[model samples]
Target: MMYIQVLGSAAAGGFPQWNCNCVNCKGYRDGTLKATARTQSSIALSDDGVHWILCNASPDIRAQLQAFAPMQPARALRDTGINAIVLLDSQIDHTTGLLSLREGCPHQVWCTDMVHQDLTTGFPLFNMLSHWNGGLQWNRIELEGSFVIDACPNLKFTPFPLRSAAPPYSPHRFDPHPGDNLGLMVEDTRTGGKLFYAPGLGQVDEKLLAMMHGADCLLVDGTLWEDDEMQRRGVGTRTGREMGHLAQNGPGGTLEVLDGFPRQRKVLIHINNTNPILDENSPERAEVLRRGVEVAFDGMSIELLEHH
Candidate 1:
């Protein structure tokens, strides 16, 4: 069985984006709305509940680790629960947290070649953090087929290239590649159950559907409620798709497609602060809950053990 804990469930800037005084942010700050503040989107996965594989290293990594006991240090002052880190992309929200983990332990950082380039060249986080500890132990993640790492021995990882753009700072931002964005399907070998984790999906095509065919759980992108959420709110000019995200409410939206998978557990993560779903008392939140989909929050944990 695999133990998964949602370390953070909000998008790039987090639920209450620091600069934006949006309604959700204002409400959450003032306790006006029944909503919880979330850190950037990230999750920790483990089989034995000891060694954990972090999916993303958000900028809020320090606070998240301080809050989650399972990922805290144990015996020695140099101890940590994070055995490996698998990045889905080179987005700032996903990779900026690597700086906070510069504790001098040769951390196993797994990513594709394209993502490595973005980090080493565009952001230079991988290079800057190299002076600390033993520096990050760079390992290439498998994209073609299922692979296993010693860190999470009981879990088999099947990674796929996702349809999302390169980070804004990436040199290949205009020229996306198969390795720039990635998704993961983790299978618990002991239970034969699967969990699909894709927090930056731009589109859901037939290929993605096929990959999700038998997944027992899905934790995917929920960056926008409307396709033009940012534009309508005058916060930004780009549509959700243009920003490499899919909206939740619209014709042929993720909600409509996800409605087909009644048996699979569908949970939305990487939610934007402007999204109406953040307000627990909002109609949008009620709509998603009525459809049997869960809006992921920080510290939410689950186990995939039904098929054993």
Candidate 2:
């Protein structure tokens, strides 16, 4: 049986975010509502039981590992390390987590060509591991194709482009580059189960929707329930939609995109602290649950055989 475990579910700043003392964080601190840290982004344990493939390493890798305990000191990564670490983009939250993984010695990484360029040039994160001797090896990916991770024969992934033209906080906001964002289609050869994992999606297009058709499950972007969640919370300077994340409500939101997909079991991931949906007892959660959707919580585990 294949099991998928949630290592972390918060976005870059995490559920409570930082610096701002919001109700969500307050609830977390008070133990009223279960709170979680924002560790860049990642998902663990594909198929084949022992073989592991993670999406991205977040900035909170150290803390995330301690909380999840996927690896032991004696078993170390190299000794029983992840088969592959696939990067969805070049975002700081996603790539910085690589530093923690570096200590495990060199491992294979799958990402796009632009991501490779950005990593080595604009962001030289791999350079930090220059002394590690066995640095991260690169396996370039194209948005339209699929590739297999050698370590786990039963696991493979396909990438689809996202329209995040500009960075969340870029000076040149008008002209953003395409392909900055991506969504993954993971297939577990063991059970023939599929999961659509897309954390950062500016907008969902036909290509993305078609790719999502008839999947066993989909863990998608849930950064906010409304566009101005940050504004209402008096947090940072941008709105959820403005930051290249989709809001869960309104005319053309995640719900709208999900409408086109009825067969797939849906779950929300990468939740933002300001989203009212985070409140377990809130009506939003009730509505989502009523619609057969579930929210991803830290440490939540789903056994595929049982789910099937």
Best by TM-score: 1
Per-residue lDDT of 204 in model 2? 75
Best by lDDT: 1
Error of 1 at 287 (Å): 0.8
Alpha carbon lDDT of each predicted model: 0.88, 0.74
Tell me the deviation in Å of residue 207 in model 2: 2.1
Residue ranges of candidate 2 with Cα displaced over 4 Å = 31-40, 76-80, 166-175, 305-308
TM per prediction:
0.97, 0.89
| Candidate 1 per-residue lDDT over residues 18-72, each given as its tens digit | 9877788888889888999999999999998989999989999999998889787
RMSD of each: 1.3, 2.7
lDDT of 2: 0.74
TM-score between candidate 1 and the true structure: 0.97
As a whole number from 0 to 100, the lDDT of residue 243 in candidate 1 is 80
Error of 1 at 15 (Å): 1.7
